[PDB]
Design a protein around this motif. Sequence first.
Motif, PDB file in Angstrom:
ATOM      1  N   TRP A 104       0.834  -1.193   0.000  1.00 24.54           N
ATOM      2  CA  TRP A 104       0.000   0.000   0.000  1.00 24.54           C
ATOM      3  C   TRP A 104       0.872   1.248   0.000  1.00 24.54           C
ATOM      4  N   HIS A 105       0.438   2.271  -0.730  1.00 24.77           N
ATOM      5  CA  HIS A 105       1.169   3.525  -0.828  1.00 24.77           C
ATOM      6  C   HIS A 105       0.326   4.667  -0.300  1.00 24.77           C
ATOM      7  N   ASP A 106       0.986   5.607   0.367  1.00 25.43           N
ATOM      8  CA  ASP A 106       0.313   6.836   0.746  1.00 25.43           C
ATOM      9  C   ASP A 106      -0.095   7.580  -0.518  1.00 25.43           C
ATOM     10  N   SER A 107      -1.286   8.174  -0.477  1.00 23.87           N
ATOM     11  CA  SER A 107      -1.842   8.803  -1.669  1.00 23.87           C
ATOM     12  C   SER A 107      -1.055  10.027  -2.118  1.00 23.87           C
ATOM     13  N   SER A 108      -0.109  10.516  -1.313  1.00 21.89           N
ATOM     14  CA  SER A 108       0.779  11.592  -1.732  1.00 21.89           C
ATOM     15  C   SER A 108       2.035  11.087  -2.443  1.00 21.89           C
ATOM     16  N   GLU A 109       2.218   9.777  -2.571  1.00 25.03           N
ATOM     17  CA  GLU A 109       3.438   9.216  -3.134  1.00 25.03           C
ATOM     18  C   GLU A 109       3.150   8.467  -4.430  1.00 25.03           C
ATOM     19  N   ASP A 110       4.063   8.597  -5.389  1.00 21.64           N
ATOM     20  CA  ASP A 110       3.948   7.887  -6.657  1.00 21.64           C
ATOM     21  C   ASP A 110       4.419   6.443  -6.505  1.00 21.64           C
ATOM     22  N   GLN A 111       3.829   5.553  -7.306  1.00 20.40           N
ATOM     23  CA  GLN A 111       4.114   4.123  -7.238  1.00 20.40           C
ATOM     24  C   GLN A 111       5.167   3.672  -8.245  1.00 20.40           C
ATOM     25  N   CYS A 112       4.988   4.008  -9.519  1.00 16.37           N
ATOM     26  CA  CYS A 112       5.865   3.490 -10.562  1.00 16.37           C
ATOM     27  C   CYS A 112       5.750   4.399 -11.775  1.00 16.37           C
ATOM     28  N   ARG A 113       6.529   4.077 -12.811  1.00 14.32           N
ATOM     29  CA  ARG A 113       6.625   4.904 -14.003  1.00 14.32           C
ATOM     30  C   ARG A 113       6.774   4.018 -15.229  1.00 14.32           C
ATOM     31  N   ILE A 114       6.072   4.366 -16.302  1.00 13.23           N
ATOM     32  CA  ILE A 114       6.329   3.795 -17.622  1.00 13.23           C
ATOM     33  C   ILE A 114       6.905   4.897 -18.498  1.00 13.23           C
ATOM     34  N   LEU A 115       7.999   4.591 -19.188  1.00 14.90           N
ATOM     35  CA  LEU A 115       8.635   5.520 -20.111  1.00 14.90           C
ATOM     36  C   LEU A 115       8.553   4.939 -21.513  1.00 14.90           C
ATOM     37  N   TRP A 116       8.483   5.815 -22.513  1.00 19.25           N
ATOM     38  CA  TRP A 116       8.516   5.349 -23.899  1.00 19.25           C
ATOM     39  C   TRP A 116       9.407   6.251 -24.739  1.00 19.25           C
ATOM     40  N   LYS A 117       9.834   5.710 -25.876  1.00 18.36           N
ATOM     41  CA  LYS A 117      10.664   6.459 -26.822  1.00 18.36           C
ATOM     42  C   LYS A 117      10.602   5.768 -28.167  1.00 18.36           C
ATOM     43  N   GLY A 118      10.084   6.465 -29.175  1.00 18.64           N
ATOM     44  CA  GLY A 118      10.063   5.942 -30.529  1.00 18.64           C
ATOM     45  C   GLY A 118      11.309   6.294 -31.327  1.00 18.64           C
ATOM     46  N   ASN A 119      11.650   5.410 -32.266  1.00 20.55           N
ATOM     47  CA  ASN A 119      12.770   5.634 -33.174  1.00 20.55           C
ATOM     48  C   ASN A 119      12.309   5.793 -34.619  1.00 20.55           C
ATOM     49  N   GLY A 120      11.009   5.943 -34.837  1.00 19.64           N
ATOM     50  CA  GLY A 120      10.469   6.194 -36.154  1.00 19.64           C
ATOM     51  C   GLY A 120      10.584   7.656 -36.544  1.00 19.64           C
ATOM     52  N   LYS A 121       9.881   8.004 -37.617  1.00 17.63           N
ATOM     53  CA  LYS A 121       9.989   9.328 -38.219  1.00 17.63           C
ATOM     54  C   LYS A 121       9.032  10.302 -37.556  1.00 17.63           C
ATOM     55  N   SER A 122       9.544  11.485 -37.221  1.00 15.51           N
ATOM     56  CA  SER A 122       8.717  12.507 -36.590  1.00 15.51           C
ATOM     57  C   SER A 122       7.616  13.006 -37.518  1.00 15.51           C
ATOM     58  N   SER A 123       7.806  12.913 -38.830  1.00 12.01           N
ATOM     59  CA  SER A 123       6.777  13.353 -39.767  1.00 12.01           C
ATOM     60  C   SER A 123       5.584  12.415 -39.838  1.00 12.01           C
ATOM     61  N   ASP A 124       5.677  11.200 -39.295  1.00 10.47           N
ATOM     62  CA  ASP A 124       4.678  10.165 -39.570  1.00 10.47           C
ATOM     63  C   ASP A 124       3.865   9.820 -38.331  1.00 10.47           C
ATOM     64  N   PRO A 125       2.541   9.938 -38.385  1.00 12.69           N
ATOM     65  CA  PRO A 125       1.714   9.492 -37.258  1.00 12.69           C
ATOM     66  C   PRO A 125       1.979   8.031 -36.923  1.00 12.69           C
ATOM     67  N   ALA A 126       2.131   7.750 -35.631  1.00 19.30           N
ATOM     68  CA  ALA A 126       2.331   6.385 -35.162  1.00 19.30           C
ATOM     69  C   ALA A 126       1.068   5.776 -34.568  1.00 19.30           C
ATOM     70  N   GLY A 127       0.397   6.491 -33.683  1.00 21.46           N
ATOM     71  CA  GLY A 127      -0.794   5.976 -33.041  1.00 21.46           C
ATOM     72  C   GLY A 127      -0.985   6.618 -31.667  1.00 21.46           C
ATOM     73  N   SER A 128      -1.476   5.807 -30.730  1.00 25.46           N
ATOM     74  CA  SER A 128      -1.844   6.291 -29.407  1.00 25.46           C
ATOM     75  C   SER A 128      -1.609   5.178 -28.395  1.00 25.46           C
ATOM     76  N   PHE A 129      -1.460   5.563 -27.126  1.00 25.43           N
ATOM     77  CA  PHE A 129      -1.486   4.609 -26.029  1.00 25.43           C
ATOM     78  C   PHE A 129      -2.874   4.615 -25.412  1.00 25.43           C
TER      79      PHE A 129
END
Length: 141
Positions: A104-129
Amino acid sequence: SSETFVFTKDNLVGNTQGSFTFGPSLSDCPAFKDGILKAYHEYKITSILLQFVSEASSTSSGSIAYELDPHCKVSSLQSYVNKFQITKGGAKTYQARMINGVEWHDSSEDQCRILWKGNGKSSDPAGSFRVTIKVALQNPK
């Protein structure tokens, strides 16, 4: 108490980079961070479904790497171990034992993190999470 929240991160392009910090820092889910989390002393996110929904061209290229940081010690993606191919999309379910969701975590504290990073082209739509969190809460405020 047990609750489910779904939120999205939209308009990703091939080089999109970012993070979700699950807890009071979860800006992408205001209903969780501003509502439910203010009504209880303790929470734990017991599972996370991370889905990448592709809008990419059949001829698109590249991948979106994603990294689970269970103790909020990683600021930007460093591990390219796991990735979604941009043309295909994908999904990953995370269990409690892998996301600091056992204690259990105190509601003032964060639990975890997901990070992402694409290596495709900035000009091209990829999608959504599309992200689904399952949250246990206790000790009303």
